[PDB]
Design a protein around this ligand. Sequence first.
Ligand SMILES: [Fe+3]
Ligand SMILES: [Zn+2]
Ligand SMILES: [Zn+2]
Ligand SMILES: [Zn+2]
Ligand SMILES: [Zn+2]
Ligand SMILES: [Zn+2]
Length: 311
Amino acid sequence: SNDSGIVVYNAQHENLVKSWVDGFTKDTGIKVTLRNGGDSELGNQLVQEGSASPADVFLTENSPAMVLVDNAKLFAPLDAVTQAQVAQEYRPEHGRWTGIAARSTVFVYNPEKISEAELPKSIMDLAKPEWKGRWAASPSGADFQAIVSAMLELKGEKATLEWLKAMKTNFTAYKGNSTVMKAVNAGQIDGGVIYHYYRFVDQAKTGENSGKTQLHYFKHQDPGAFVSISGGGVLASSKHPKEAQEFVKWITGKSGQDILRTNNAFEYAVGVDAASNPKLVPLKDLDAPKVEPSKLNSKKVVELMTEAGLL
Ligand SMILES: [Fe+3]
Ligand SMILES: [Zn+2]
Ligand SMILES: [Zn+2]
Ligand SMILES: [Zn+2]
Ligand SMILES: [Zn+2]
Ligand SMILES: [Zn+2]
């Protein structure tokens, strides 16, 4: 009665997705095979595989890889119920994909090293000479590259490249946002630019990587207050189209969004009238900038960051 199920190219954090798959397979009997990787490499893989891909669904941490795959005309339109399930602000103006979760940019900092009042007012302030040697990031990741794509959209190419060149002077690189957080936790550096969920995830475990940190929210519709939207799409090449649609409907529906609210991943729910974990600052209180996800440009970001010597 059930076949072998679907193949999901999964670029979202494995433990978030495991909470979804467990519930989904229990509910529907549809088996899920995860093939994990980062947003960029999985997006490029889909483009290069094209119609020969075994992928039924693509999930991402951020929006730019969704835009890349949609630009290649590789997605199927999402079923009507799926489109109605997600709040308008978390659906692209153009493109055959949907938001599935969201995350807030933050400045993670160590209060034993540096004090709320001392934090940068704007992410743009991190370019100033007084910030030299005082902040970290993980430039190779799709997470940080998405924050740069928002800056590109909000401030334009000239101002973004300028900030990136100053970043080269000022920042210290670590591989992975968890690594950035741990570095701040250990007092290696005053702070860093990451997403909000890392601290919550660790605090729900042992807290050994996060107890000496706190989170700062830039607010003010600052580029640093960017809320990155995680994406899901069904591949047009899918040989399991209904099961694929069922999966994206499920994760964006009441069951999937309830799991975001209650699991130990601590990412924001994007469903219509879907509340998030009560430990989180509500989305409506973040004072985030308006950034159209379908305008975000991963290729241009890589070009600018490469020009700045960051990649
Ligand atoms: Fe991440
Ligand atoms: Zn990889
Ligand atoms: Zn300091
Ligand atoms: Zn603060
Ligand atoms: Zn203001
Ligand atoms: Zn099937």
